[PDB]
Structure formats: C-alpha cells, structure tokens
Amino acid sequence: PLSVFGDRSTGETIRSQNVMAAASIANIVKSSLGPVGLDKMLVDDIGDVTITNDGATILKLLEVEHPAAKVLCELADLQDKEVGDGTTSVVIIAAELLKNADELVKQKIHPTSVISGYRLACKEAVRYINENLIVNTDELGRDCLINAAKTSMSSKIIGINGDFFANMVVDAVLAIKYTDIRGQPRYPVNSVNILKAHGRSQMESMLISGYALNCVVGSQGMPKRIVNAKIACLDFSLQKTKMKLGVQVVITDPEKLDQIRQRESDITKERIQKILATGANVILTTGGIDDMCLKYFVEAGAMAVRRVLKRDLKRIAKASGATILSTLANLEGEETFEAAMLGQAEEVVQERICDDELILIKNTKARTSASIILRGANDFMCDEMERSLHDALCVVKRVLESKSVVPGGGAVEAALSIYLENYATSMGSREQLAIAEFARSLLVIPNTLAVNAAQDSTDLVAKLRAFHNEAQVNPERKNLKWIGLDLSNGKPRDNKQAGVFEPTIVKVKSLKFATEAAITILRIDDLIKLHP
Amino acid sequence: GMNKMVINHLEKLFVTNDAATILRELEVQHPAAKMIVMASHMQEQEVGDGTNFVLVFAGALLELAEELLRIGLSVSEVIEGYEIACRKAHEILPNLVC
Amino acid sequence: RPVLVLSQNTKRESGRKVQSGNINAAKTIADIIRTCLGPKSMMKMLLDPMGGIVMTNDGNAILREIQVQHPAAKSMIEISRTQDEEVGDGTTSVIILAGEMLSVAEHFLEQQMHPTVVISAYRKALDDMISTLKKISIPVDISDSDMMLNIINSSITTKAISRWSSLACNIALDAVKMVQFEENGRKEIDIKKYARVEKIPGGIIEDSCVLRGVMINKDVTHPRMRRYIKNPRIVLLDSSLEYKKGESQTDIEITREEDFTRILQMEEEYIQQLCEDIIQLKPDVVITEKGISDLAQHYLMRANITAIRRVRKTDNNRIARACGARIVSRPEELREDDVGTGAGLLEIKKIGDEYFTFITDCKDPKACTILLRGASKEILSEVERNLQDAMQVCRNVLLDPQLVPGGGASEMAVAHALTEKSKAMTGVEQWPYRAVAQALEVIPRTLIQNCGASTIRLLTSLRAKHTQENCETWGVNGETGTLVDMKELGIWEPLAVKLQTYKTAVETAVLLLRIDDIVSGHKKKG
Amino acid sequence: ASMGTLAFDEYGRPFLIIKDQDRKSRLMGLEALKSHIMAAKAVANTMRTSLGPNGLDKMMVDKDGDVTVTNDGATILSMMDVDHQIAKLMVELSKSQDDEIGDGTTGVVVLAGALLEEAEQLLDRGIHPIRIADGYEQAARVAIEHLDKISDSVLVDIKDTEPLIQTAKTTLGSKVVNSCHRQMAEIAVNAVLTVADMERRDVDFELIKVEGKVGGRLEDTKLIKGVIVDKD
Amino acid sequence: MMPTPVILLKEGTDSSQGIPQLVSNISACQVIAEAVRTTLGPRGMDKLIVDGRGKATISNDGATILKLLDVVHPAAKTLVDIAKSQDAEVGDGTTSVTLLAAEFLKQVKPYVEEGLHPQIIIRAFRTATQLAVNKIKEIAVTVKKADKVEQRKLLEKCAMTALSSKLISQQKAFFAKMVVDAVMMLDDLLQLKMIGIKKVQGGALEDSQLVAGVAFKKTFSYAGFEMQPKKYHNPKIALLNVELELKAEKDNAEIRVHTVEDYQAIVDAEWNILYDKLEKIHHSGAKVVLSKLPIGDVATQYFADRDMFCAGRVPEEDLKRTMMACGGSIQTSVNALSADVLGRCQVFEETQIGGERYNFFTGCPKAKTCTFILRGGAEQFMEETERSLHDAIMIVRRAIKNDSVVAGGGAIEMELSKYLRDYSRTIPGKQQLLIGAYAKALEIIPRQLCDNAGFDATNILNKLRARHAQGGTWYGVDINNEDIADNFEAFVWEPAMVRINALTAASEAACLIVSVDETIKNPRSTVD
Ligand SMILES: Nc1ncnc2c1ncn2[C@@H]1O[C@H](COP(=O)(O)OP(=O)(O)O)[C@@H](O)[C@H]1O
Ligand SMILES: Nc1ncnc2c1ncn2[C@@H]1O[C@H](COP(=O)(O)OP(=O)(O)O)[C@@H](O)[C@H]1O
Ligand SMILES: Nc1ncnc2c1ncn2[C@@H]1O[C@H](COP(=O)(O)OP(=O)(O)O)[C@@H](O)[C@H]1O
Ligand SMILES: [Mg+2]
Ligand SMILES: [Mg+2]
Ligand SMILES: [Mg+2]
Ligand SMILES: [Mg+2]
Ligand SMILES: [Mg+2]
C-alpha cells in the first residue's frame, strides 16, 4: 500500500536493532578499557597490521554499515578531537545509556520522558562534578601533571615506563608554553614533532631540546654539523629561472641567445649570493634545490635542505626567530636580503638513527621548542607509542589549561550514580525512572574496569557504592569521594591519595556527548531503507 | 563444571558435563586424540567414572613429555621414567585409603 | 538483505585462542631458523619469486625472503629487520630469544595470571639484564689491531667466509678504518654510502682485496684517451658537456642566409668555451655524471685529458671522497681546490670481457671499494653479506669499545645473576621473572644442539659451573661441544650487539603479550 | 516489519533461531489486521455484484480450462484460486453457510466484508480489536433477537403449497432459471414434500436424484415420481 | 590461530564459548518469548502460521504456536520443551512458562555480564523456586466440605477462567458448563479418549452440543441402507468385530471337488454360513448392529428386510465409546450373543448436521463417555475451539484430582514477588540481588496482561504492589475496568498445580540454560 521501493522497520524492531548495533560497537572496544585492558591487532585485508588500544583508531579503521553504530563511531572521533582522552569511555557510556533507555521504552515509558530525564541527569551530574568532585592543581604542583600523564599512559604500551614517559611528556609540554593576549597561558600541542624510528629500547627515547627534522642535507659535499647556525627559512625553489606563461623568448639577432641562457642561471646565482652574503649557515626551503645551487651552498660550507615540510618550517622559524620568505622583494622594488630575517640556534647536526639520518636543530634561541624521538623494536610498537604519547600530551594540555582534576578509577561514576539515584526522587514520576536508569548506566565504567582484571566485579562495585553512599550521607566522611578502584589488588583505594587523576573536561565532555548520542538514537522509531 | 551443548551430525542435542558422552558426540579426527578418547571409553567401560580424569592426566603427561623432549631427554628415557613413576604411584595408592 | 553491523568480510577472534595463536606463530618463526645459529650452522636455499636463488644462513635474509600471513609472524620479521639494521648481527639470536620468552610467557598465560603482570616482570628482568651485561663487560684498546681482527674473526666464525678468516678480517678492518671521517667536530663511519662492495664473478676468493681508492665499471669515452695515468689530477662534474635547450621556450626566427650557420657555429663555440674553462685548471681526468658531447671529447683530447661520462651520483661522491675532490656543476667556477690531487694511479683495465676503471693509489682516502672475485653470483652475494656483518661489528666496536663473552657464556651469566636476584622478590611476579631469566639458556642450548652433543648434560654442567664465583666467561665450544673458558677460546661479542638483542627480544615479547583480540578483513579506507 | 528478525548477535557470532529464517516472512500488529481487512474487502466487493435478482454471473475457469458460469457464491469461492489465508477463510465461510443452510452463501461474504470495513475505521481510532469483536457479538445477539421477534410463520401442509412455492420462487429469482421460475419452484417443492419424514424430521437428499441431459429446453425439466436410469 | 596441518575436530565444527554465547542464548530465549508474548490474557490475540504445504494453523495456545515454529537454536529449544512439558503435565499455562523462563534469563543477563559465577545464579533460582512453591501450597485456598454444588461451582469457575482467553470466550460460561458436565461423567481414570470431539462445519458456536451418549459420522452405507428405519425407541445394540461378507473362509483355504453336486453344495454352504451369522445376530434380539469390520450389501439388505439398522467400518474408538455408553461388549464371534453383551440406549436416531449424517445414541443413564459436536464456519475455527475445550477439560480433570485454587490475573505472582522480596531483604547479599531479580521477573505476567489489554502497565503494577504490601493476597489485574480488583471475589480461579508446574519448569529451564558455557555444532552429515 505504501509502495516505497525499500525496506521499512517500525516500532520495537528498529529500536532493538539500533540498540543491538550500539551494543556491538561497545562490546568491540569494551575489552580495551583500564590498566588491565589489552590492545587489539587490526589487519587491513592486504597485510597491513595495526596494534592499538585507542578507541578512536579502532572505530575509524573498522568499516561500519549500521547508522547507529556509525553515530557511535563519529561520537568517539569527536571525543578524540575535542579532548583527546576518554574515547572508549564515552562510547561505552552512550551504549549503556541506549540500552537502559530502550529498556524503559519497552516498559511503555514514552521516549520523550526518557530524553527529559537524561537531560536533567546530565545537567545535574555536571553540576555535582563541578561542585564536589574537582581538585585544584594549585596546591599539587608538578606532581599533579606527572600523575595525570601516568594515568593517561596506563592501559597503553608505555604503561610500566610511566615514571620516565610522564617526565618526558611534562617537559615537552612545558617547553612549548606560550602566552597569548588576555594573559592566558596556551599550550600548542601538535607543535611537538614526534619522530618514530625502531632500534634501541623504549627507555632510549630522546626528548630534543630543540626541533627534529625528518630530512637530510641535499648534497654530500656540505658539512653535517654547524656550531653557530644562522637559519634562513625560504618558501621558494632555488632552481634555474624559467619564465611564466605570459613571457616568451623570440630570437631574431642570434648573438643574444648565449646571454639569455647565461642569465637564466645567473638570476638564481645572484639570489643565492645575496642570501649567503649575510652570513647564513643553514638554509631550509619548502621547494626543491637543483645541483647548481647545491654546489653554491657546498662551496660556502653551509647547510641546504630541500623539500622541508611547511609545518616543520613554520615551527622552526617561529622557534628560532627566523621569518619565512616566500620571495626576495622589499618595499623599494629591489631584491634584497638582510640579516634580520635570520634565525639562530646554538647547534645544527645530522644524527644517525638506526641506519638512517635526520637533522637536529638543537637549542633554538628566542623561543624554546621540543621534539620527541620514539625508539621501539618495530614499526607497529612505534606507532602505538606515538598514539599513546599524543594521548598523554593532550591530557597534560587539558590539565594545564583547566586547573581542575577529578579522581580516576571509577570514583566519579560511583559518586554520580549514588547522587543521581538519591536526587531522582525529587523530579517528576517517569523522568525519575529515567534519571535512575541514567545513574545505573553510569556504573558500567567501574564494572568493566573490574571485569577486565578478572576480579569480583559485583562485590567490588558494591563496596565502592557503599563507600560513596557513606560519603554522601555522613557529612564528616566526605573524604571518601576519592575512593576509586585499585585494579592491582582488586580493592577500593583513595585514588586522589594514590595519584590517579583525570581532567574534569574529559568527564564533562564524555557525559555530554554520550547523552546527546543516546538522545539522537533514541529519537528514532522507524527506518526506511531505500534500495540502491 | 559447566554443561556443554554438543550437537552431533544428526542434529541431536546433548547437554551434559560427562566427558565420555562429550567425546562420543564429538567428531574427533586426530588419531592421537583418538587413542586418548579410546582410553577414556575404556575407563568408562571398566569403572564408569573418571573419564575426565583420564583426559586431564593424559594431557598433562603429554605436555610435560613435550617439555622434557625440548630440554634434551630422549623419548625412551621419558617413557621409562613415566612407567617407573606409574609403578610407584600404584604402589603408593593402597596406603592412601581412608 | 544482510543488515549487518560490520562488513560481512570482517572477522573477529578474541580470548585465549588469540594469545595461543600469536605465541605459536612466534614459535614457528623461531623454529624456521633455529638451526642457522652457531659456527656449525647449515645454509639454506631460498627461491625468490623472481627466479633468483638466495643461498645463505644469515637469519635476516632467510626471514626477509619469507612471506607469511599471520600478523604475529610479520611482527617477528620486522623484529629481525630492526635487529639487522640497528647493529648488523645477532638476528638469529634475537629471533630465538623472542620465541623462547613468548613460550615461557604462554606457560603463565595458561594459568590465571594477567598479561600485564608478565609484562611488568619482563621489563624488570630486562633492566636487570642490561645491568648485568654492563657489569660483566670488558674494555678494548682500539689501537690494538690484533684485538680488532680477533673480534671480527669471532663475528665471522659462524659464516661461510670463515674458510678465509684472516683475509676477510683484514678487508673489513681496513675498509672500516679508512672510511672513518671527522668533520666540524662530528665523527662518522658511514659504511652504507662509502666502502662499496663490488663483486665480479670469476677468479678466486683469495684474490679479493680492498683498494686504496675506488673502482667503477666504466671505460674511456674515446679510444685515443690515455688508459694509464701516473698521477692524475681529477675533476668531477654534474652538468653535461653538451649543448642543451633552455628552461623557457626560446623559439628563433631566421630570415637571413647566414643565421643558421651562425647558430650552429655558436653552439660549437659554446662547447669550445666550456672545454677551455675545464682545461684552464690543467687536469688529467674529467668525470661526469651526465653525457659528454663528441666535440667536447675532441677538445679534451686536444689537451691530453681522459674523460668518463654517465657515472652514478653515489659513485661520483665516492670518487670525491677517495681522491680529495669536490663535484662542480659550472666549469667557469672551477677553483683550484676542486681539482682532485691525491690519487696516485688511474688505470683502465679489462677484467674478463669488460672494462673497469681503477683509481686505486690514493693517499689518505676517505672512501674505498671492496673487489670480490668468486665462484658465482650467489657465493659472492653471501661473501658480501658476511663482509657486511664483519664491517658492522667493527664499526660497533669502534663506537663502543666494550666486549662481552660469547659462546653462551653471557646468557648463562645473566641468567644466574637474575636468578640470584629473584630470590629476594617475595612476590607474585617472581615466577615470570625467573622464567624469562632462565629462558636465556636457549642460546647455549641451541649451540649444543647444532654442535650435536648432549643438551641436558652439557647445560647442567654449564649451570653448575656458572654457580661458582668467577665463571661468567665459561661457555660452550661450538665445534667440540665442550665447556671452555672464553678467555681461552677467544670468542667475544660487542656489548652493543648483546644489549640490542636482549632489549629487542624482550620488547617483542612485551608487544606480542599485550594483544588479545584480532579483527581482520576490513577495507584499507585510505 | 517483515522477513522476521535479523540480528546476527551483538558479538558478531551467528544468531540462528528458526530454520530458513532468512526466507520466511512475518507481519506484526496492526498492519497484519489492515492487510487482512483489505483482502476480505476485495473478496466481498467481488462477491457483492452477484447479489439479488439483478445480480450478474461469474464465469469460472478451472486449471483444465473447463468453464462454469454460475451465481452461487459458495461455488464461485470454492472454484476461486486464492492464496491469501483470509480469502481461504472467506471461502470456508461460504462453504459453511452452504452446508448449514444452502442459501445465502453470497450474503455472508458481503456482510463479513462490510463488518471488517467498519472495523478498519474503528481500529484507526484506537480501539482494541477484541472490543470490536465483543461489540459485534452483542449487536449480533440483538439482531438475532429482533429477527426472532419479527419472524412470521407459514403452513407447511401438502394441501396448500402456496407459501412454499413463494419461498422457492424467492430463492430462485436470482438464478438463470427465473424464466421457468414458477415451474422450477413447483417441482422443487413437490420433490421435497414427496420425500420427507413428515414429523418435522430430516429430509434425505440421497432420495432426490438430480439428473441432467443436454438437448430440449429448460421448460422440459420435469419432476418424475420414480427413477431415471442411464441404461436400457 | 594456526593452520595445524592435521586438525583435531572435523572441518566445519562451529564452537562458541564464554560469556558471549550465554548472552546469545538469553537473547534467543527472549526472541522465542516474543513470538507468543501477545497471546496471554483475555485480550490476547491469535497467531497464524503457514507450513510449507500451504496449510494455516490459527491458535492462541502457546505450546501449539511454539511447536509450529521450527526452532533450531539449541538454547531456544528448551523453552519449547518446557512448553510441551507444561501441556503434558497440566494442559494450561504454556505461555506463562515461556514468559517466566525468558524473564528470569533477561533479569539475570546483566549479572551474567559482569562475570558472576553461573552456579550462584542456579542456586538462587533453586532456592527461590522452592520458597515460591512452598508459599503457593501454603496460601492456596481449599474447601474441605465435599459439597457437590460447591465442587461444581468451583469446577465451572476454573473452566471459565481457563476459557476466557480464546475465541470462544463469548460463550465461555456455556462451554464451561458443557466441559464440567462431560468430565463429571467419566468414571475413575478421566481418560481423554472417552470424550469424543466431533467437528462439523456450519452453524454457530451456540449450536454446539454435548451428547449424553455417543455419536459418530455415517460410515459408507451400502445398497439397501436407505430402506432401514432410522429411529428406534428402545433398541438393543449389538457391538461386533465381525466381517459380515461373502468371502473366502480363509486366506489359505482351498476347495477341491470333482462333482457338480459338491460344487452346488459348496456354494450353498458359503451362503448358509453368511445367513447363519446373520440369523444369530437377528435372533439375539438386537435392532442396531455396529461392526468394526466391513458389513456387506447382502447383510445390509438382510437387516433392512428385518427393520434393523446396520453400520460397518465403525472406528475403533467410536465402538469403545459406544461400549462405555450403552454398556455392551464387542464380540468377535456371534455364536454366543446373550443379553449380557448387548448394548442398550433409550433412543437411537440418524439426523443431518450441517450437510452430514450422524448417528446418535442418547438416553444412556449409566454412560461413562461423552461426545462434543462442535460447529463453526471453518475447519481452523473448529480446531481452535477443540484446543480451547481440551485446555478446559485438562483444567477440570486436574481440579477434580485436587481442588486447591489460587486467584488469577497475576495476583498469585504479585503475592509471590512480595514474599520473595521480603525474604531476599534478610540474607547476606550476594544471593539477595539474584532473589530480588527473581521476584521482579515474577511480575512479567500482570505487566503482559496490561500491555495486551492496552493498559498502562507501570501504574497498574505500582497499585498492585502497594495493595499487596499494605494487605491483600488476591488482588490482580481487572481487564474490564482498567484497574485492579480482588480476583478471588471476581471468580478468576486457577488450580494451584498450574502455577506450581509453571514455576518449576521455568526455573529448571533457566538453570539448564545458565549452566551451559560452551556450544559445539558438528558439521552436517548427508546434506543431500
Ligand atoms: N592506575 C589506575 N588505577 C585505577 N584506575 C585507572 C588507573 N589508570 C586509569 N584508570 C581508569 O581506567 C579508565 C580507562 O582509561 P583508558 O581507557 O586508558 O582511557 P581512554 O578511555 O581514553 O582509552 C579511566 O577512566 C581511568 O579512570
Ligand atoms: N667458535 C665458537 N664457539 C662457540 N660459540 C661461538 C663460536 N663463534 C660464535 N659463537 C656463538 O655463536 C653466536 C653467533 O651466532 P650467529 O650464527 O652469528 O647468529 P647471528 O647471525 O644471529 O649473530 C654468538 O652468540 C657466539 O657466542
Ligand atoms: N478474567 C480474567 N481476568 C484477568 N486475568 C485473567 C482472566 N482470565 C485469565 N487471566 C489470566 O490469563 C493468564 C493465562 O492466559 P491464557 O492464554 O488463558 O493461558 P496460557 O497461560 O496457557 O496462555 C493467567 O495468568 C490468568 O491470570
Ligand atoms: Mg585514556
Ligand atoms: Mg565422575
Ligand atoms: Mg651473527
Ligand atoms: Mg439466495
Ligand atoms: Mg490458559
């Protein structure tokens, strides 16, 4: 009767299908949560192998067909983009919210009431987190950053080496700190170049007090070490001059051909001489350099690097004080280069790293930069260390920007569940049930944490809930808010005392994103799938 | 122990935790596993209980025999040691009657 | 209508099966080359898909010529390649060690121990392994050529080149010593670019030598040029010596009778001017990476200059290092310092049925070529691989003058030290610690097995010997299968090689132990 | 809404519950009721044009090509090749009416179709179908009581067959024999009355032999107080 | 894994182990419960299932629907098996068993997901089931007065409650009266084969009748049958197992004669044998002759000449019912046809019912059998009426065995849930969550009643819980008034054994499903 060329699912069928898809996506990554989590091993049906624990990477690599499962995948991607941590937790929380909301709907509770209850519960959870479960980093110091980095790098391939990796991460982040207008200390992560090279053990990873380039000098005749570097950054190729489409050479007097051909290269020769006359020692250009200009640089005993990446060149110029010069042209119509456009560094070398070489711009002046060279045993572990290191850098950036941290190890979820279960009784009749189910769904994180360690999840979660209930009831035992989970011994533990910290923004954004995803999927009650 | 649903080639259900029944309903193809299954069935015929004990003990013995062969012992030495230890165990067993 | 969540080609395995499969794949990788370790190792024939034959017993070559599907095996192959690239030796050792550690880890994984505990125990054990290796090392006087030759020999006793040990040791030592360079306060060896290995099939292996210079497979451009110059002055170029089109479109328009002839005459005059600029330095040999015109050849022969064209850039750089010259692209900017003085003889001679150019009497050359004469191509390839191993060992020793006893002594000493340390742990992770400590016995065990002696008796005797106080240098004699002191046998290994092997094997075990779920079949999505 | 369920588990493992579940269809809830109502409406609307003296005939062709022109609703639905289960229910309802009474096999289908058509718009307003069925049962009881109230009695004596003749004529008025209407009614009444257990007991149709031979005219149809045999 | 050049099991062996397979089993049980979910309650709906041959089955019975479903899931087959078990032992509640088992599994699925040990769940189910059965036996209402009128009223109420969910619910009182009357006339074993069920197309449900005797369809009359009188006012019935035909004396018999006189003598001897059998039957005094074996045309004409009735090829069960009604004995030989072995009924008659001829044996004062004649517009209509009457008959038989009743409409289960929650609130705590889950799962039936009736399940459940907590045992769902009511005062009665068996079977199924950790499927052999 409808005569729509497609398949139609209506009622509880499509709701159950969506919930099943979300549950499948959650179950894929549920085994990679927490320090006792384990990595996965993806194969790209052509022999390419990826070993990772990051939820965003796992969900991106997988090819997904169901729309709700997609929704969860881009939810994880957005969580990674805006925070960088908690990518698995947000997906798990959203799927559990969907499960319990579907249970309520199947109990003939209208989805609008469930959505309103979820919104109220999310708002109240954010308020409670901001008012009761935050710790200021002012009275903690560098130890707070170290502990946050170590907690972030737990459940990762660099977990045991945290005592070293957290120090490296904190030093790298503090090295690139800059203050913008409004007096706000900003930490531009992704300005720390990460280089991966297999070889020595992970403990031999080096933190460069400068910058690291994944490129070598263009000619073997140039020196491979300059002490007092005068870096000159360029954005134009140094090649034989060729004229544009609007210019054409037509010869009538044959005696001028030699002069034309000679000047074609003499133009670039004069440009090189002008650049070198200012004492420049290191020349970096995004464009290519041909043999003639390479020999020009060889004769002067100066560096010359071609095909430098634009972002790397920008970072080097910003750190060293050099200015990018896309062309040599002043405001007088001439073609000049003065020493003012020269950056300075106290050493530029070309080190050898496991049968390959790279350029180290050591200790740039006028600004401190940083770079990390990750040493592993193969490419897969190097990539995984890069991902984990990026996660740690993002966590440290969040902690340094917003000076609030929250206890880890399921403490926040348990406290939120207790508070929301108590609070639901004061809001409506069915929205009360929705808030109660939100509180119950929030308990999946400690449940999964305990399960992954083969611990007694039920008893451990019951003890955690009892501790948090005692904290929230008795007004002199408020110090039990920090009681989280200790997966090494399978016992509750004061995580704030134990130094298990997470940024508050991680929890807030994860809660908001999971609630919005659950609301979006829960709104559907019918599906029409047109044939392609 | 946990029950196992075993479905033979004739779509007949078998939910049980009896090792002999599970092996009977399983289409075992490896001939060494066939010897182990035959030993289990012989134990079932002679006594009626202890088939799972037979499986577990045979598996442990063969695992440790593989370990011993890897560390350097010859097959004959492992066999003679196993037989001597079996004789000693049979000698000991009557003294353990409570 | 297959609704589906994931694609129908996506397959997921998880649980104990994944761990068991990964560990079994690593064990199979180890078992492939288990027999290719030690002085009594046997060689293997590898049939390339392109039709070539690779006959070798080097671990990395064998693993590289093998294609596998299980991604754990791919990880092990990557481990082999990393070990080969970083230090150049110990590939079979690291593969075997990784397999053994993964086996002893599977033992605990069968029980109710979480992999994270095993990984932490492995990392603590690796730290103690590094400490013990640094503790039991001995220094080396690099100025003592005899010690360096002995080290290289100990490196190459396990290869097919061991039949000619003194010759190979001298070749490798001389090449490494005279490729060593120091500029601007930076020290380098750079075996990869310079110190070229050129193999010519035929002749005898005893005729192999390392030249005090460079040798290329090139002939003079014109026969009238001299094929034997006593003390040549060499000039190197990149740009061609022929008339070439400009970068921009440069169409001409001829309306007069004499303009065509004038154009051709000016082309000839440009060639003449380039040749005159080159001749102004009064050289004897001109080398170019690009073509040299016939008219340029005439103008060069008029000045009694030998010219060679179309040379590889790497070969030109090697010549520049050898003869003390630098390549110049524009002849009009040819300075006196660019002229290569220092080559003591240049000679073009025919080897077999092909001409070869020799610059082989340079004084203080910073580049060299190794001329290998042998039975066939495969024999020369294996000899080249052995020479690469020897040269890598020599450069590692030069960079780090520490040595460690070989022949299984180091593994047993480190195992005993770690076992003694584990007696005070009093924890739950002491068992994996001791297991991975005693897993180091697989190296002496493999040496004994390849030698053909009794494994259990010899290992028991070696362990009893190592339980004494000063017995860290007691190992297995790979030939006779007897316990000897390695300060008597003289087998030693660089500390860098042992450190890299141990670190890489332990980290391979850690990486593979961390994995418990495999999903495959999805599209690349590039 | 169709084909059943397709989940294949939330862990990716196969999820097979019913044999050949991939090629089996399923209808759930109100749409099944709407489909059934529409099928029954189609059947009833096909039938209703053959209702009454001015009703027209249906020309039925079987699988062998034999042609049967008829007005009897039960015969039409019995010879109708339907596949829908509700249509089969309509066919069985017509056969039931024919077996119990012998007349009215077309009125029942029209009445059922009208009832389901009204039930459609009742369901659209959110009434449980069970309540609709209960209301229909109550109204049917009321209608049956009213029919009993307004019923009238006739004499079934053999001396005065006029009411019987009129009833038979009313029955035959919708058939093709309405040309010989009175003769047909007379012979039917006489045939029934001749063979019948007088004490209001059963009428044995085994003793009424209906034989037809081609040729002649319809007016040549006659009641023979004996036996006609196809022998000599 | 690894290729393992020679493998352990046969190729194609599919194995699933761990928590995921148990979760999948629970989901499969949920799927099975969904297929029969809407058939429960007075507002329940029928399901239509078509087989491969094209035949359609319409039924409100849970067991029938599950059987018609061709379930292949190993865990899901347990629900069908327990439905069959409930049908066999009790006959009613085949939907409740599946709903309760699936609800148990669904309630314990979350606890399974955190890795709770299945043995703990099994022990909790066993304890809860024992407590619930004991509570049912304790609080079940029984009347120890042995009043015949009160017993009849109780049986009628139980039959009405068992019938008020089918298509014959409009005539539920009338059909329940038939069922009670039919069951009360069985002697001591209440054998189902002693109650005839005849389905005749045509007529309304109110046209269905119960025959205080035996009735069966006319069976292939021969020539001369229509001359036999079709009504007798005190007939004597001869129940025979005899072939009254002109036939060979025996299969291996062979006659050898050499004279035409002997030929004629043999022919006359065969005729005289047949006529001697017929004359013995006639002189026995009987007027109605029924035989299991065929009765020939010669015998039919012989009995017609004597104003007698004959009916051969009578089905064996019909002959047994005629025995139990009239009170004769089936004779394989007619040599001794005394008055002891002759049946007797007040009135025998042949009438027409919906275009079919039926023989009636009414007026039997000491009959031990019955015969239901069901009328309907379709064969599936009569089939489902027969199924509903079978449910009612089984319920009435069980009530005869023991008249221990509990109120329906979910009142008994709400009381059980309250009691189980009260018990669970006083135990260490690991078992407390599982027993509370069991008590919550016990609430599925009233919630399903409300959902099927179009109610608001949450409000009705809250009101029921409050009423049970504050005092009141037999308060359940009132379907008509959109509210709750004391179902005992509403005469919504069920035998206690119905709920006892339902709980026992559901708990056993749940424990069996939970106890399985690995499923192995061998490759199919002889796929053909
Ligand atoms: N040392 C620890 N002890 C207890 N819990 C921890 C510890 N470190 C991290 N966790 C918890 O484990 C959870 C999982 O974090 P993880 O999965 O690594 O981050 P992501 O979700 O970004 O992948 C976090 O919510 C954190 O609270
Ligand atoms: N003459 C010898 N006697 C005993 N052991 C030896 C002797 N020469 C070398 N070895 C041992 O053999 C090992 C080298 O094996 P090799 O075949 O080179 O493997 P790889 O190529 O992986 O290094 C060293 O660990 C060394 O201790
Ligand atoms: N008049 C009624 N009012 C409320 N509930 C009823 C009534 N009659 C039956 N029920 C309920 O219907 C349930 C059984 O439904 P039914 O389909 O008749 O049997 P089955 O359980 O075999 O499917 C019983 O639990 C009973 O409580
Ligand atoms: Mg994290
Ligand atoms: Mg036993
Ligand atoms: Mg070696
Ligand atoms: Mg009519
Ligand atoms: Mg019932």
Side-chain angles (χ1 to χ4, degrees), chain A residues 85-86 152 156:
Chain A
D85 205 31
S152 170
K156 300 294 201 268

PDB file of all heavy atoms in Angstrom, chain A residues 85-86 152 156, ligand 4:
ATOM      1  N   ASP A  85      41.211  12.258  25.198  1.00  0.00           N
ATOM      2  CA  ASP A  85      41.193  11.137  26.123  1.00  0.00           C
ATOM      3  C   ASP A  85      39.752  10.742  26.410  1.00  0.00           C
ATOM      4  O   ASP A  85      38.814  11.495  26.140  1.00  0.00           O
ATOM      5  CB  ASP A  85      41.916  11.479  27.432  1.00  0.00           C
ATOM      6  CG  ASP A  85      42.451  10.251  28.141  1.00  0.00           C
ATOM      7  OD1 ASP A  85      42.808   9.274  27.453  1.00  0.00           O
ATOM      8  OD2 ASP A  85      42.517  10.264  29.388  1.00  0.00           O
ATOM      9  N   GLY A  86      39.584   9.545  26.966  1.00  0.00           N
ATOM     10  CA  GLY A  86      38.258   9.047  27.267  1.00  0.00           C
ATOM     11  C   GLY A  86      37.466   8.591  26.066  1.00  0.00           C
ATOM     12  O   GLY A  86      36.233   8.589  26.116  1.00  0.00           O
ATOM     13  N   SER A 152      47.089   8.628  32.243  1.00  0.00           N
ATOM     14  CA  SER A 152      46.742   8.574  30.828  1.00  0.00           C
ATOM     15  C   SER A 152      47.508   7.470  30.115  1.00  0.00           C
ATOM     16  O   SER A 152      46.953   6.771  29.259  1.00  0.00           O
ATOM     17  CB  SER A 152      47.015   9.923  30.170  1.00  0.00           C
ATOM     18  OG  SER A 152      46.903   9.827  28.761  1.00  0.00           O
ATOM     19  N   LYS A 156      48.312   1.553  28.240  1.00  0.00           N
ATOM     20  CA  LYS A 156      48.992   1.755  26.973  1.00  0.00           C
ATOM     21  C   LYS A 156      50.329   1.028  26.989  1.00  0.00           C
ATOM     22  O   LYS A 156      50.829   0.622  28.042  1.00  0.00           O
ATOM     23  CB  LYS A 156      49.200   3.247  26.689  1.00  0.00           C
ATOM     24  CG  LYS A 156      47.909   4.039  26.609  1.00  0.00           C
ATOM     25  CD  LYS A 156      47.073   3.604  25.421  1.00  0.00           C
ATOM     26  CE  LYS A 156      46.083   4.680  25.021  1.00  0.00           C
ATOM     27  NZ  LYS A 156      44.772   4.489  25.695  1.00  0.00           N
TER      28      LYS A 156
HETATM   29 MG    MG F   4      42.802   7.309  28.266  1.00  0.00          MG
END
